[PDB]
Amino acid sequence: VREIVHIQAGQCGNQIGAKFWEVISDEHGIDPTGSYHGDSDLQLERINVYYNEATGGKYVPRAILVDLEPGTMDSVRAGQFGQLFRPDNFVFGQSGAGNNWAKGYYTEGQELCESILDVIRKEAESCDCLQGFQLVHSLGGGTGAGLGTLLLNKLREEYPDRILSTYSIVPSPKVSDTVVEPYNCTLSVHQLVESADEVFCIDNEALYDICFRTLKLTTPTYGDLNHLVSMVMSGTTCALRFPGQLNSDLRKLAVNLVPFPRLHFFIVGFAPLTSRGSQQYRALTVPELTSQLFDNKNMMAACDPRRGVYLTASAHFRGRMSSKEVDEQMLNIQARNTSYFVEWIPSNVKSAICDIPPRGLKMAATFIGNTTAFRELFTRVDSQFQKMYARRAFIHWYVNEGLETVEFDEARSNMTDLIQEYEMYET
Amino acid sequence: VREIVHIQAGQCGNQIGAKFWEVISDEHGIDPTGSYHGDSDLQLERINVYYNEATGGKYVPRAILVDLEPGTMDSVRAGQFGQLFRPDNFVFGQSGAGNNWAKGYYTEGQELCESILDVIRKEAESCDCLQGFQLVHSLGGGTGAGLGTLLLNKLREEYPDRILSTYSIVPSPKVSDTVVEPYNCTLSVHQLVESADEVFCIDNEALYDICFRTLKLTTPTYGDLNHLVSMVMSGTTCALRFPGQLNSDLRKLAVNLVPFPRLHFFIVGFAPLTSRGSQQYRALTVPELTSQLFDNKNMMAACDPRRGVYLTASAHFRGRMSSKEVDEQMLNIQARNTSYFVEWIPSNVKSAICDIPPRGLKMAATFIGNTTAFRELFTRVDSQFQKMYARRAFIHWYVNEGLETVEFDEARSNMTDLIQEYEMYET
Amino acid sequence: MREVISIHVGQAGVQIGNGCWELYCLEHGIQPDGQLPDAFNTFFSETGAGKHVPRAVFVDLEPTVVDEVRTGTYRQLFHPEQLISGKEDAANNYARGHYTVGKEIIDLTLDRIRKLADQCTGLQGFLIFHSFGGGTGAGFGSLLLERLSVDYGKKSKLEFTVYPSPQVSTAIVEPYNSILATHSMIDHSDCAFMVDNEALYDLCRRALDIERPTYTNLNRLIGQVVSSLTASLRFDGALNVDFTEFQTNLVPYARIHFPICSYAPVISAEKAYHEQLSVAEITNSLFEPANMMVKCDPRHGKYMACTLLYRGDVVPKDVSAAVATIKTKRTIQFVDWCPTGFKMGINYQPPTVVPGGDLAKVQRAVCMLANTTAIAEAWSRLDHKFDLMYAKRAFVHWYVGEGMEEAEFPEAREDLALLEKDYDEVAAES
Amino acid sequence: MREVISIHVGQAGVQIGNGCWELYCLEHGIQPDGQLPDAFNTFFSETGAGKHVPRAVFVDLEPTVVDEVRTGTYRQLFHPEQLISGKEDAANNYARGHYTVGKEIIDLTLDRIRKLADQCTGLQGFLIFHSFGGGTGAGFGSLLLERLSVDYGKKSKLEFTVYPSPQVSTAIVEPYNSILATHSMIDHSDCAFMVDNEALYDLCRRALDIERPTYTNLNRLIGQVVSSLTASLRFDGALNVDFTEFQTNLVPYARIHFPICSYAPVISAEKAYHEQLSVAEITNSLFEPANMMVKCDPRHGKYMACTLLYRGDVVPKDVSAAVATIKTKRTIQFVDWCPTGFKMGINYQPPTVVPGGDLAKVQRAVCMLANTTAIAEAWSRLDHKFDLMYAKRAFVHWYVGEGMEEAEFPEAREDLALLEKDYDEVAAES
Ligand SMILES: Nc1nc2c(ncn2[C@@H]2O[C@H](COP(=O)(O)OP(=O)(O)OP(=O)(O)O)[C@@H](O)[C@H]2O)c(=O)[nH]1
Ligand SMILES: Nc1nc2c(ncn2[C@@H]2O[C@H](COP(=O)(O)OP(=O)(O)OP(=O)(O)O)[C@@H](O)[C@H]2O)c(=O)[nH]1
Ligand SMILES: Nc1nc2c(ncn2[C@@H]2O[C@H](COP(=O)(O)OP(=O)(O)O)[C@@H](O)[C@H]2O)c(=O)[nH]1
Ligand SMILES: Nc1nc2c(ncn2[C@@H]2O[C@H](COP(=O)(O)OP(=O)(O)O)[C@@H](O)[C@H]2O)c(=O)[nH]1
Ligand SMILES: [Mg+2]
Ligand SMILES: [Mg+2]
């Protein structure tokens, strides 16, 4: 009984969440009509974490959909698992998406915020317990980046104790999808740093790179890209949902990985991944999982760890396995590559074990780490923001929504200090 | 548990590699699909030396294939034993071979080197132990001669302890297959002498000559030529793979046969050899094997030992046979031809016995020796090098890559001293 | 559900509108009578039973072009009120189309457009078409836009206008109407797209294999671009792009807003046998100066912002690879202060062919919209053309006689010079 | 996989191009329509369904030769873009094909050549054909190479051109165009093979039993040489030879890159019925001056690095025996500083016969490329023929009027002298 409320914002957030509920429903064995037809009694132990009960033994997810325009959820209504969602949880505006952080936050955000919050209050106060909130949003966009941060602050104000873990897609470092991304990202950075306990950064370029390198997918679509992400959040919450030899929930993760309140941005990765042709030849075991996890190519964010140094790391394991083998590997990889770890923190790596692996895979692992390599990610947007901010004129679009000049200067100054904060702790 | 990592480079190495794995897989009894269907339990004792296991009841060789073009690789895929190799171990470029040592070393070598090294690191750090690395490459080409030496230097840097035994094909003096052979060989010799522990030299002239004299092959192809090489590495590592009355592995061989760090180039030969129709008339005993082993016509290197003197020699015997008979022949052959051995090192013939013979032979023997006859091989290339070097113009194809002209002088200077070093020890 | 309104002013707008709805009826699958043998409500309105109606208004000060649709086959599709025709045209005179005759009918049309907006609950943008050289296109277009700015305020007013060609010219007074309308467009329009006939002619002969095209063929090429632009709002896609998204990214300044357009692939039947038409190939074609429908070389200027719109078989993986390849071509210039410069949009609905058409049935296609200072080459030619007329006062008498004060001639000249300063000041680097 | 791009210039280029592409399609398996009733990727591109398109460009400044292809049987195979035809030929004038008329079409041709390069992921070189005496071949060919040198740089540009015959000449101004082209060939080309019609005429009569051949027969023999050269790049063999390997072996000096070509066996369909044609026989036939396809005797000079290519039944053991026998020939000369002098390669695909062909169905065959100092004999003849015409200034007026500055005449004369010195300087011994 550690219920988690799920909120989806924007074009990116809604479509990732739709793929998310396919994975969780299949794992628990929930039929698309909303009724259990699965195969194990263990699935019914703690289904309360994500699902709320309906009459007639029907189970409804604790999901809330947020957008500024109806087009997105109309596709969701036509989805395979569209029937699963609760009809009233669809909250939306009737104005243009904007792709503008100022417009999404102020003009349409205030009207949307009040209606959304009471919808959240329906699920938040309907169950016996509530551990944390889960948010999916885009930062390069206007709706998810703008309205998501506004709703993020309100969630903290009403529920300070609960864990505000969010999943975000980062504006791509090399080729991206919006000209004014540095404006939208930098403004959201100030809101994200102070309010959110845990932030995971995701890049599409790595998603393209992982699919081409390992999976050999000639035409990897957003369905495949959203599928790979959906393993990450499924694995993290698996500790709550199933028993294991060493339990590790969100609050355990935050205490171990976060040494200081602002250094909490995380890189994530999943193992095992193998091409269909080459999956026969592999010797899948615990050490083989360790090789993939710490491999720089598998990490789902385009910030090469070898260029930085590690502060904390954590690995999750699923399956009936040896405890010694997991504990031995975590020590070996620590001593082998000491050049990338901080001296003044020993035992930089955390480990955990879960009993039930996902379908089709006898064993699976998830890796989450924190390192100074994020300075690369922020340097990219910082240099591009300065190049924009010399050219004032784009502010004129944001000025129409009441955004003042000091907001851009405040956003950069805090984000620049975030780069500096990671710089000093490297010593 | 003395695993050996196998690396193949160039057009010559890959075609040799394909025939080599036919011999080893046949001896152990592995189905071309990668499954065991053999006939003896002794085969499964120490198959770990060359093979890795896949969870689907599959056995995979510890092989890494390197080339600059896919044309040689695609031939191997269509080979009979193509499916055996692990799909990810194929590392290839997208540029012509060039047949240029400078181009292979500098331009295309650096790009491939980093990718190849980590693939090697996969197999190198995957097994409980690793005795040495086995390399197959040609010294008259541009790909194997250039990139093979570059990878040889990097292997020494990361794994100084391990035995870097290599098998090389030296350009044939009578009929050269490449106009620029002297340039490529001389530059590679400088890298090979200082870095490699053991080097075996093979000449196609003797392979043609032995096939015509002994086997009576009217039309011997490269399949037969590469097959005659096949048992040489098969016999050498056979001491690791199978029990015997006296074991002798690579490190035993290197210590005995190498008196000084720079005098380690070896001549090799195999017995018995008989035409496929004259085998009926030949009684097969140990003394008959020794007669072929020391006969000058059975050496696969075209440097007559009689023109030089012997320093060290080793013989390997496979099959259930008398130990006295082997020991007496070494004494007899040493005393009978004292004119060809150095006085100041007694007992120049080393011996070893292995229990299990190879397939198709009831008793077999392998010879490895070191002698001053290598001065003939280096005289041929050096005399041709001086002829070519005065006509500086072929350096044009090497200068454009970035090679300095003084490197040619350095390569000749070191190889000249190696000729001198063998000259002095003849006294 | 979500609505967009189209307004057509002048003969060029009416004929293009005929081609545009000709394409949309085929695209959605709606018979010319309004029956069926989805995205309908974005462009159409239902009347019960089985009859649909376009959200369009046709305006011209003379009935010849309008009566063609009235007598044409498509007559039953359109609502009779939507077709508004004047009595006598503006005679290619800006003053006649703005002050004397324009004000006779301006408020009659404004009631009609506002009436259509009542049925458009999700109205979030207008589409307005012009011909700069025409009197009604410039004179009446300015008067309509000035009213629509105050009638609706912060609603996106998108324009698709035919700019005068560098050398191909059919009206002597063509430079006069263009500069006068220039002042009206720059302040009131949210964003106006530039195209010219001379570049349209050349592409219609080289890429599409036509010996001798007509205005009908040129209009169908125009309709394809608008269909691709509106496909994001109408049909499903991995990367939806809204009108406001185009407004925010494409224009770095308020007055620099003017973009340029391109489309690929533009290929005939037999030429499509031999080309595989990959994502990389079609993206590569969008950047050659030969494919611009504005006859200005991009190499004369630089690129500030670009938007890519893909339809059909396209997969997001190849888009990132294709765009990254484009970035390497530094025969193409971007200003350092705009490093990103791209938004891509992916849609699943393939292009729709038309009977008697000129395009091959390609499985995938892409549309291009970008802003550049290469347009400043076009403005300089118009400025030099105008000065020759006005130095000797070549046609002042006609315009003053129709109510216009002469003082508007230098003021429109000054506004053009100020806009030309803006582009060159923007072109400066730090 | 790994691709080679072919450019054809002039009447000689197009007609040789016919002979080559019949043999390639009539080797691989492709019908003239592009369908099938492997190595395809090296020479052909795939468009889906079952249709293939060559990686070739055909260029001439006059339409007669190209329109034969457009109206011919093989018209459907080629992409209409690939066939480029000018308006009026250069009239055997170097300046006209270089400065005045050549620059009218040069930038159109390079776009299509570069466009084809995009599809070739594994491009490893180009093949270019010329006629030295022609105006377009020498004039436009020099302009094409100079651009391709800077466009792509470190990619092998291999050429296969027709050198002027020692006595047979169809153009009076032949010496003028050849020498001006020679300066451009030497500095930009990686390697260029020489063949001349006079030797092929004698070979096609003696070896092949033909009373009175035409250009079609000579082009068929040319097609065999190019196919054997690429045979190592298309099908399996015990000794592969890549394009980059030929570049290093056959080029001893930066400016001594011209090889000479020979092929064996060359026997009629009747007389092969009596002869076994072992490896020794075919290897022995190559070195005779009668077989060689350039009318210069190697015995006059010395030999350089050579290449041997074997197709079909050949076994590597017999190659070493045959080549060793070659070294025993005291009628063959080598320089002491080139002791090895040989590179051999073997492919298993046998030669392909031609519809209505002139050759026999030989099971095994050999192709040969050699660098020799005997080519200085050819250079001296061309040099002497040039001085007589320039001394009295026989034809300077035509070239001057078409943009050429007369100072080019002594420069091309001086550059040829240095090459003649280079061949003598290298031929010296120490
Ligand atoms: N591309 C294209 N341009 C057109 C078409 N019809 C008219 N034009 C343009 O319109 C210009 C002439 O002005 P008009 O067509 O008369 O437009 P107008 O505003 O109604 O002018 P008036 O008739 O005087 O009221 C020409 O120069 C064309 O460029 C068309 O069907 N296609
Ligand atoms: N072997 C061979 N040579 C040819 C063939 N056609 C033309 N030639 C050679 O080309 C020379 C004449 O020049 P052209 O064929 O016209 O080449 P060009 O560069 O196009 O010259 P222009 O027609 O003036 O543009 C002749 O002397 C021939 O030697 C051919 O089909 N086979
Ligand atoms: N992987 C993935 N990325 C998406 C998806 N939808 C949108 N994005 C990315 O999200 C970024 C911004 O999208 P946007 O439409 O502006 O989101 P919003 O404005 O917050 O609703 C773009 O760079 C897209 O590449 C999706 O379904 N999958
Ligand atoms: N015995 C044998 N020799 C070979 C084989 N393939 C190539 N060679 C020899 O290797 C030498 C050089 O080969 P090359 O292609 O240049 O190797 P690379 O350039 O390093 O890949 C030539 O003289 C060949 O005779 C083979 O399959 N067997
Ligand atoms: Mg009109
Ligand atoms: Mg010609």
Author numbering:
A (entry chain DU), B (entry chain DW): 2 to 428
C (entry chain FM), D (entry chain FO): 1 to 37, 47 to 439
What does the paper say about this structure?
Doublet microtubules (DMTs) are flagellar components required for the protist Trichomonas vaginalis (Tv) to swim through the human genitourinary tract to cause trichomoniasis, the most common non-viral sexually transmitted disease. The flagellar core, or axoneme, conforms to the canonical 9 + 2 arrangement wherein a central pair of singlet microtubules (MTs) is connected via radial spokes (RSs) to nine surrounding doublet microtubules (DMTs), which transduce force generated by dynein motor complexes through the flagella. Here, we determine the 16 nm, 32 nm, 48 nm and 96 nm-repeat structures of native Tv-DMT at resolution ranging from 3.4 to 4.4 Å by cryogenic electron microscopy (cryoEM) and built an atomic model for the entire Tv-DMT. These structures show that Tv-DMT is composed of 30 different proteins, including the α- and β-tubulin, 19 microtubule inner proteins (MIPs) and 9 microtubule outer proteins. Like those in other organisms, the α/β tubulin heterodimers polymerize and assemble into rings of 13 and 10 PFs that compose the A- and B-tubules, respectively.
